[PDB]
PDB file of all heavy atoms in Angstrom:
ATOM      1  N   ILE F  41      59.574  89.695  45.529  1.00 96.05           N
ATOM      2  CA  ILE F  41      61.032  89.592  45.468  1.00 96.05           C
ATOM      3  C   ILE F  41      61.540  88.579  46.491  1.00 96.05           C
ATOM      4  O   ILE F  41      62.371  87.710  46.183  1.00 96.05           O
ATOM      5  CB  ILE F  41      61.673  90.975  45.675  1.00 96.05           C
ATOM      6  CG1 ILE F  41      61.445  91.857  44.448  1.00 96.05           C
ATOM      7  CG2 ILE F  41      63.155  90.842  45.961  1.00 96.05           C
ATOM      8  CD1 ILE F  41      61.537  93.333  44.738  1.00 96.05           C
ATOM      9  N   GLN F  42      61.025  88.660  47.720  1.00 96.76           N
ATOM     10  CA  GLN F  42      61.484  87.772  48.779  1.00 96.76           C
ATOM     11  C   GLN F  42      61.061  86.334  48.523  1.00 96.76           C
ATOM     12  O   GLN F  42      61.804  85.407  48.844  1.00 96.76           O
ATOM     13  CB  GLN F  42      60.966  88.252  50.132  1.00 96.76           C
ATOM     14  CG  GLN F  42      61.792  87.767  51.308  1.00 96.76           C
ATOM     15  CD  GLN F  42      63.281  87.866  51.050  1.00 96.76           C
ATOM     16  OE1 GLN F  42      63.818  88.954  50.840  1.00 96.76           O
ATOM     17  NE2 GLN F  42      63.960  86.725  51.062  1.00 96.76           N
ATOM     18  N   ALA F  43      59.865  86.122  47.971  1.00 97.05           N
ATOM     19  CA  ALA F  43      59.436  84.769  47.641  1.00 97.05           C
ATOM     20  C   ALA F  43      60.339  84.149  46.587  1.00 97.05           C
ATOM     21  O   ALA F  43      60.696  82.968  46.681  1.00 97.05           O
ATOM     22  CB  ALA F  43      57.984  84.776  47.171  1.00 97.05           C
ATOM     23  N   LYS F  44      60.727  84.931  45.576  1.00 95.80           N
ATOM     24  CA  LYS F  44      61.650  84.411  44.570  1.00 95.80           C
ATOM     25  C   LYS F  44      62.991  84.048  45.198  1.00 95.80           C
ATOM     26  O   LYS F  44      63.541  82.963  44.946  1.00 95.80           O
ATOM     27  CB  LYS F  44      61.840  85.437  43.455  1.00 95.80           C
ATOM     28  CG  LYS F  44      60.728  85.459  42.433  1.00 95.80           C
ATOM     29  CD  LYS F  44      60.813  86.695  41.563  1.00 95.80           C
ATOM     30  CE  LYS F  44      59.599  86.812  40.661  1.00 95.80           C
ATOM     31  NZ  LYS F  44      59.722  87.950  39.712  1.00 95.80           N
ATOM     32  N   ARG F  45      63.520  84.935  46.045  1.00 96.20           N
ATOM     33  CA  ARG F  45      64.799  84.655  46.693  1.00 96.20           C
ATOM     34  C   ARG F  45      64.708  83.429  47.594  1.00 96.20           C
ATOM     35  O   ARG F  45      65.625  82.602  47.624  1.00 96.20           O
ATOM     36  CB  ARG F  45      65.263  85.870  47.493  1.00 96.20           C
ATOM     37  CG  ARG F  45      65.893  86.964  46.657  1.00 96.20           C
ATOM     38  CD  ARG F  45      65.758  88.304  47.344  1.00 96.20           C
ATOM     39  NE  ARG F  45      66.357  89.383  46.571  1.00 96.20           N
ATOM     40  CZ  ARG F  45      66.462  90.634  46.995  1.00 96.20           C
ATOM     41  NH1 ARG F  45      66.012  91.000  48.182  1.00 96.20           N
ATOM     42  NH2 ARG F  45      67.033  91.540  46.208  1.00 96.20           N
ATOM     43  N   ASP F  46      63.609  83.297  48.336  1.00 93.01           N
ATOM     44  CA  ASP F  46      63.447  82.176  49.253  1.00 93.01           C
ATOM     45  C   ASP F  46      63.315  80.858  48.505  1.00 93.01           C
ATOM     46  O   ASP F  46      63.860  79.839  48.940  1.00 93.01           O
ATOM     47  CB  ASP F  46      62.230  82.403  50.149  1.00 93.01           C
ATOM     48  CG  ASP F  46      62.461  83.481  51.183  1.00 93.01           C
ATOM     49  OD1 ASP F  46      63.555  84.081  51.187  1.00 93.01           O
ATOM     50  OD2 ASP F  46      61.546  83.729  51.994  1.00 93.01           O
ATOM     51  N   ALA F  47      62.597  80.854  47.381  1.00 96.18           N
ATOM     52  CA  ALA F  47      62.504  79.632  46.591  1.00 96.18           C
ATOM     53  C   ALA F  47      63.865  79.241  46.035  1.00 96.18           C
ATOM     54  O   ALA F  47      64.238  78.060  46.056  1.00 96.18           O
ATOM     55  CB  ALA F  47      61.489  79.809  45.465  1.00 96.18           C
ATOM     56  N   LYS F  48      64.637  80.222  45.558  1.00 95.09           N
ATOM     57  CA  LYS F  48      65.980  79.907  45.082  1.00 95.09           C
ATOM     58  C   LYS F  48      66.853  79.367  46.210  1.00 95.09           C
ATOM     59  O   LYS F  48      67.616  78.415  46.012  1.00 95.09           O
ATOM     60  CB  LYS F  48      66.617  81.142  44.448  1.00 95.09           C
ATOM     61  CG  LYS F  48      66.357  81.258  42.961  1.00 95.09           C
ATOM     62  CD  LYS F  48      66.343  82.704  42.516  1.00 95.09           C
ATOM     63  CE  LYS F  48      67.741  83.272  42.473  1.00 95.09           C
ATOM     64  NZ  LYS F  48      67.722  84.754  42.529  1.00 95.09           N
ATOM     65  N   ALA F  49      66.747  79.954  47.403  1.00 89.02           N
ATOM     66  CA  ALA F  49      67.533  79.484  48.538  1.00 89.02           C
ATOM     67  C   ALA F  49      67.114  78.089  48.975  1.00 89.02           C
ATOM     68  O   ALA F  49      67.947  77.317  49.461  1.00 89.02           O
ATOM     69  CB  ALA F  49      67.407  80.460  49.705  1.00 89.02           C
ATOM     70  N   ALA F  50      65.841  77.748  48.808  1.00 88.51           N
ATOM     71  CA  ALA F  50      65.339  76.423  49.138  1.00 88.51           C
ATOM     72  C   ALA F  50      65.455  75.450  47.977  1.00 88.51           C
ATOM     73  O   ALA F  50      64.988  74.314  48.091  1.00 88.51           O
ATOM     74  CB  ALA F  50      63.879  76.509  49.588  1.00 88.51           C
ATOM     75  N   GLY F  51      66.059  75.866  46.869  1.00 92.54           N
ATOM     76  CA  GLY F  51      66.234  74.970  45.747  1.00 92.54           C
ATOM     77  C   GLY F  51      64.977  74.733  44.957  1.00 92.54           C
ATOM     78  O   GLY F  51      64.893  73.749  44.218  1.00 92.54           O
ATOM     79  N   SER F  52      63.992  75.604  45.101  1.00 95.89           N
ATOM     80  CA  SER F  52      62.745  75.550  44.364  1.00 95.89           C
ATOM     81  C   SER F  52      62.713  76.688  43.354  1.00 95.89           C
ATOM     82  O   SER F  52      63.663  77.463  43.220  1.00 95.89           O
ATOM     83  CB  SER F  52      61.557  75.624  45.320  1.00 95.89           C
ATOM     84  OG  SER F  52      61.572  74.546  46.235  1.00 95.89           O
ATOM     85  N   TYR F  53      61.606  76.779  42.629  1.00 94.84           N
ATOM     86  CA  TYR F  53      61.388  77.853  41.672  1.00 94.84           C
ATOM     87  C   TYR F  53      60.062  78.512  42.002  1.00 94.84           C
ATOM     88  O   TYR F  53      59.028  77.841  42.041  1.00 94.84           O
ATOM     89  CB  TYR F  53      61.386  77.328  40.236  1.00 94.84           C
ATOM     90  CG  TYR F  53      62.743  76.898  39.740  1.00 94.84           C
ATOM     91  CD1 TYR F  53      63.059  75.555  39.603  1.00 94.84           C
ATOM     92  CD2 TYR F  53      63.709  77.834  39.411  1.00 94.84           C
ATOM     93  CE1 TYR F  53      64.298  75.158  39.151  1.00 94.84           C
ATOM     94  CE2 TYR F  53      64.950  77.446  38.956  1.00 94.84           C
ATOM     95  CZ  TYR F  53      65.239  76.109  38.829  1.00 94.84           C
ATOM     96  OH  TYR F  53      66.477  75.724  38.377  1.00 94.84           O
ATOM     97  N   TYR F  54      60.092  79.817  42.244  1.00 95.94           N
ATOM     98  CA  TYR F  54      58.870  80.559  42.522  1.00 95.94           C
ATOM     99  C   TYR F  54      58.211  80.908  41.197  1.00 95.94           C
ATOM    100  O   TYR F  54      58.709  81.755  40.450  1.00 95.94           O
ATOM    101  CB  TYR F  54      59.163  81.815  43.335  1.00 95.94           C
ATOM    102  CG  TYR F  54      57.931  82.644  43.611  1.00 95.94           C
ATOM    103  CD1 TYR F  54      57.010  82.253  44.570  1.00 95.94           C
ATOM    104  CD2 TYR F  54      57.678  83.809  42.901  1.00 95.94           C
ATOM    105  CE1 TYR F  54      55.880  83.001  44.821  1.00 95.94           C
ATOM    106  CE2 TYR F  54      56.551  84.563  43.146  1.00 95.94           C
ATOM    107  CZ  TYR F  54      55.655  84.155  44.107  1.00 95.94           C
ATOM    108  OH  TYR F  54      54.532  84.905  44.355  1.00 95.94           O
ATOM    109  N   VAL F  55      57.093  80.254  40.905  1.00 96.92           N
ATOM    110  CA  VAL F  55      56.332  80.516  39.692  1.00 96.92           C
ATOM    111  C   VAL F  55      55.357  81.635  40.032  1.00 96.92           C
ATOM    112  O   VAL F  55      54.334  81.411  40.678  1.00 96.92           O
ATOM    113  CB  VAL F  55      55.616  79.266  39.185  1.00 96.92           C
ATOM    114  CG1 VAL F  55      54.816  79.585  37.933  1.00 96.92           C
ATOM    115  CG2 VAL F  55      56.619  78.163  38.913  1.00 96.92           C
ATOM    116  N   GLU F  56      55.693  82.850  39.610  1.00 98.75           N
ATOM    117  CA  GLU F  56      54.868  84.011  39.905  1.00 98.75           C
ATOM    118  C   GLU F  56      53.463  83.821  39.349  1.00 98.75           C
ATOM    119  O   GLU F  56      53.248  83.093  38.377  1.00 98.75           O
ATOM    120  CB  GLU F  56      55.496  85.278  39.319  1.00 98.75           C
ATOM    121  CG  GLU F  56      55.917  85.177  37.851  1.00 98.75           C
ATOM    122  CD  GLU F  56      57.209  84.399  37.643  1.00 98.75           C
ATOM    123  OE1 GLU F  56      57.154  83.151  37.599  1.00 98.75           O
ATOM    124  OE2 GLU F  56      58.277  85.035  37.525  1.00 98.75           O
ATOM    125  N   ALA F  57      52.500  84.477  39.987  1.00101.71           N
ATOM    126  CA  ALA F  57      51.117  84.356  39.554  1.00101.71           C
ATOM    127  C   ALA F  57      50.947  84.935  38.156  1.00101.71           C
ATOM    128  O   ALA F  57      51.622  85.891  37.767  1.00101.71           O
ATOM    129  CB  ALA F  57      50.184  85.068  40.532  1.00101.71           C
ATOM    130  N   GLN F  58      50.042  84.333  37.393  1.00 99.57           N
ATOM    131  CA  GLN F  58      49.752  84.835  36.061  1.00 99.57           C
ATOM    132  C   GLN F  58      49.177  86.242  36.147  1.00 99.57           C
ATOM    133  O   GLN F  58      48.508  86.608  37.115  1.00 99.57           O
ATOM    134  CB  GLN F  58      48.777  83.909  35.340  1.00 99.57           C
ATOM    135  CG  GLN F  58      49.283  82.497  35.169  1.00 99.57           C
ATOM    136  CD  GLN F  58      48.659  81.805  33.983  1.00 99.57           C
ATOM    137  OE1 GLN F  58      47.518  81.351  34.045  1.00 99.57           O
ATOM    138  NE2 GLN F  58      49.403  81.723  32.890  1.00 99.57           N
ATOM    139  N   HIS F  59      49.455  87.039  35.124  1.00 99.99           N
ATOM    140  CA  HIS F  59      49.050  88.434  35.145  1.00 99.99           C
ATOM    141  C   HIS F  59      47.539  88.546  35.010  1.00 99.99           C
ATOM    142  O   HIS F  59      46.933  87.921  34.136  1.00 99.99           O
ATOM    143  CB  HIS F  59      49.750  89.200  34.028  1.00 99.99           C
ATOM    144  CG  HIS F  59      51.228  89.323  34.221  1.00 99.99           C
ATOM    145  ND1 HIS F  59      52.111  88.329  33.857  1.00 99.99           N
ATOM    146  CD2 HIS F  59      51.979  90.321  34.739  1.00 99.99           C
ATOM    147  CE1 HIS F  59      53.342  88.712  34.143  1.00 99.99           C
ATOM    148  NE2 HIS F  59      53.290  89.918  34.677  1.00 99.99           N
ATOM    149  N   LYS F  60      46.932  89.334  35.890  1.00 95.45           N
ATOM    150  CA  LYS F  60      45.492  89.531  35.904  1.00 95.45           C
ATOM    151  C   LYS F  60      45.036  90.709  35.058  1.00 95.45           C
ATOM    152  O   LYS F  60      43.841  90.821  34.782  1.00 95.45           O
ATOM    153  CB  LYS F  60      45.004  89.726  37.341  1.00 95.45           C
ATOM    154  CG  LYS F  60      45.379  88.598  38.277  1.00 95.45           C
ATOM    155  CD  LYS F  60      45.029  88.934  39.714  1.00 95.45           C
ATOM    156  CE  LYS F  60      45.172  87.715  40.608  1.00 95.45           C
ATOM    157  NZ  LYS F  60      46.431  86.970  40.328  1.00 95.45           N
TER     158      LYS F  60
END
Side-chain angles (χ1 to χ4, degrees):
Chain F
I41 288 157
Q42 203 43 62
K44 280 167 187 185
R45 281 155 180 185
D46 288 2
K48 269 151 74 201
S52 300
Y53 289 106
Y54 178 76
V55 179
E56 49 283 83
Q58 300 206 282
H59 293 83
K60 304 173 170 45

